[PDB]
Amino acid sequence: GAINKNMKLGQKVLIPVKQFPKFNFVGKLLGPRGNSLKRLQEETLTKMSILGKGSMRDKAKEEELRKSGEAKYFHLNDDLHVLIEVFAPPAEAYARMGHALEEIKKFLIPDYN
Amino acid sequence: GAINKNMKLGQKVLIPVKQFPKFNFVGKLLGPRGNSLKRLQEETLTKMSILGKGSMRDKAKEEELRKSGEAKYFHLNDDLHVLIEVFAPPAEAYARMGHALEEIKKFLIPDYN
RNA sequence: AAAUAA
């Protein structure tokens, strides 16, 4: 499209549950009351959501919401992931995404305490 | 205080470490993902935290924090225990603490795994 | 069995 027309970007970032079994990443990404994710979107000027299987603190509600069929719950069949999104001019859109994907690496490795 | 004004209650509940040596009660109480403790508050309408010496899984981390001197770690000198807390009008609060105190006894017995 | 939930 047009180089100065604002654009919407989106990239699904897989959360490594197969490589780090049993570690609660969702708690780690959000931190206390979500201020580790609030702060991480503010830092990079993107918007981030944790979607997919297990993104919700229960198998059951997340299973029902999933069996409902509504498009808003399409993500709960996909693997657990963070969806980073940005709306800005193209040069800015890709640059912040690139920025955002560098600062998120640390939340996708365990704490070892 | 006043009969329908809300009050705070707290009651330490001791964990029998002398009686079942080396049994991990902390894991039993929190279960997976911390949700057997979390469900036990929802059922009883209380709030619960595990404090005292041995509440943390790293004995040297816990002794740093204990030395550190901050009031938030004062509990790491007391015996290992669950501190049940409630904020409600007196009638409800005492009824919930009691409910919680019967419903907590199951978790103060080891599993023989 | 280890408590962060936007």
Author numbering:
A (entry chain C), B (entry chain A): 48 to 160
Article sentences:
Here, we have determined the X-ray structures of the T-STAR KH domain in its free state, and in complex with AAAUAA; KH-QUA2 in complex with AAUAAU; QUA1-KH in complex with UAAU; and the full STAR domain in complex with AUUAAA.
All our structures of T-STAR in complex with RNA display a very similar mode of RNA recognition, and show that the KH domain specifically recognizes three nucleotides with the sequences U1A2A3 or A1A2A3 as illustrated for the structure of T-STAR KH-AAAUAA where one KH domain binds the 5′-AAA and another KH binds the 3′-UAA moieties of the RNA. The RNA lies in the classical KH hydrophobic groove that comprises α-helices 1 and 2, β-strand 2, the GXXG loop and the variable loop4647. The base of the nucleotide A2 is specifically recognized through an intermolecular hydrogen bond to N71 side chain. Additional nucleotides located 5′ or 3′ of the (A/U)AA motif are visible in our structures but do not make specific contacts to the protein, suggesting that only the (A/U)AA motif is specifically recognized by T-STAR. All the KH-RNA contacts observed in the X-ray structures are consistent with NMR chemical shift perturbation experiments showing that the residues of T-STAR KH and Sam68 STAR that display the largest chemical shift perturbations upon RNA binding correspond to the residues that contact the RNA in the X-ray structures. A comparison of free and RNA-bound structures of T-STAR show that the presence of the QUA1, QUA2 and the RNA do not induce any global structural changes of the KH domain (backbone RMSD ranging between 0.44 and 1.05 Å).
